[PDB]
């Protein structure tokens, strides 16, 4: 078991718990889990993964132009992506509830809503506020005491 | 146009064909490709691949700063990288026996030896002769073969 694997393991673990405080205004019975952009870590997620209270999370990865991105996911898994991709695809997911996290993110200051630091002795994340305010989907406030 | 996931496959026999054209000085058993860095078409793959003579292609994501790349890797399918990260993989092939292909077609400048361009009807690809000759590894110039024809309609 490599690091990268170990840690995409530990991603999959990191967004279950994450999931687990984000309620969507219709709950669907299977969490559509789109990969999108180039990512690391996201091996874990793409095998499939199934919530506490039994709901199974479906993960394929979708292209940074799909247009559908908002209609198609319900939650997305960022990965790299250019300022004009990453604009494309927020504009996607504009006025759908859709819970978003990045692999990486610097700052955390536009688009997603959750931002990973993967690399480390564990992993963290980071909330954008304003993100998740204008997200569609509820966010239980207690998941910002597992952020840094 | 292709879903991801015909491109991922798509990406698997690409790798296939170049592979073909490639001779390692001590052939393994089994080939060790290694994924590096964030891909978006390398899932085909990470589920392992067999050649056409039977020898299997055991793949597998490793660090960016894994220092034994060029020892554990026979083959290094690059990803997205920066250029800080690229500068230590490429640091880690030097004389060692790696054959590198990269996701993206910027890196035939910077020592990937092939570079894919997935978007697109067809998977094309292009070649670095410098990064080719210090490699380790032997091409058949015949591996242009596959590059021209996958750039005709
Ligand atoms: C594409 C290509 N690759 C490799 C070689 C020699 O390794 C040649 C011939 O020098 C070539 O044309």
Redesign the interface.
Known sequence: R????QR?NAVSQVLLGIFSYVRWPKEPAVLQLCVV????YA?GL?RGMVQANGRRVHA????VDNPDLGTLCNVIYL??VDERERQQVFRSLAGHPVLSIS?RGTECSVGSMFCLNVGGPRITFEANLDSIARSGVRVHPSVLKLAR
Do not use: H, K, M, Q
């Open positions: 490599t690091s990268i694997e995409s952009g180039p990512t690391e091996d793409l394929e990865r979708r292209a990965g790299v692999e």
